[PDB]
């Protein structure tokens, strides 16, 4: 039945009305009723009547505490990206470097051309990424799709334990320039994420359907056996870049999409994604949850090689939402199998 929704697991785009836009969790459940989640990624274009902020002109003084220079090594569609942290800098400083002759966008006709250039010059002229900047650019009173307070059940983590995890249940801001990249990964605990491109040049995305996630992992393990041997989930290091021609070569299903300023992207549990920025821009993101996520959370395979990695205690979610399974789960005997095609239960209100 849901098997029959988005049979191609293609990236879907939505144009909600303002009445639809007002309840975040509701619209997420809706797009899942339409099979959007099968793609691992979905675009949502907000009503033109809407804006998260009046103007972005006071932010030249905002500090980027930890700019990252992205060194990339590799060949033939396979790359490993190393982060070189640069000293702190303000936005206008970043912007100046970004639009500088050395680091600015090349001229191009169709997107296929800029894309080809990205994959040809990835390892050259390492850019700087203004990544993981704590904060929001939303105006304090915006109540629709506010990344700072979406009110999903992920709120149960801070609510029950007081724990905050930067970028996960708090917002992150991302200042990009041309050729800055995000490597193939799913979210921490295989959560959802939301990404809003506040302003600037586009951000392009690749995505692999959750139902084909394991095949991407098998490929990645084969191409990086040393890292696979060292960590049960080395893709979570977010250092691994794989070109679309390589995915095609090895029969991994995927889709691509370009995100424009003023547009939202949603990633879904266990949706592998990667991409790059076209030029100077600014993006805001955080994670969020639905009831459907809970099983993904319980089964997420986590990085086994670092003390510093995000691990959310699933106990509270299982007690509150799977009370009949708690004893079974705690006893390690819960063998529930995940069906990536099924929408979250909250969509019962639609379906
Ligand atoms: Ni992500
Ligand atoms: Zn690891």
Swiss-Prot record:
Q: Where is the JmjN domain?
A: 11-53
Where do the annotations place 2-oxoglutarate binding? 129, 195, 203, 238
Question: Where along this sequence does the record place binding of Fe cation?
Answer: 185, 187, 273
Residue stretches making up the JmjC domain:
139-305
Its annotated function is as follows: Histone demethylase that specifically demethylates 'Lys-9' and 'Lys-36' residues of histone H3, thereby playing a central role in histone code. Does not demethylate histone H3 'Lys-4', H3 'Lys-27' nor H4 'Lys-20'. Demethylates trimethylated H3 'Lys-9' and H3 'Lys-36' residue, while it has no activity on mono- and dimethylated residues. Demethylation of Lys residue generates formaldehyde and succinate. Participates in transcriptional repression of ASCL2 and E2F-responsive promoters via the recruitment of histone deacetylases and NCOR1, respectively.
Family (UniProt)? Belongs to the JHDM3 histone demethylase family.
Which protein, by its recorded name, is this? Lysine-specific demethylase 4A
Q: Which organism is it from?
A: Homo sapiens
Entire protein: shown range: 4 to 354 of 1064
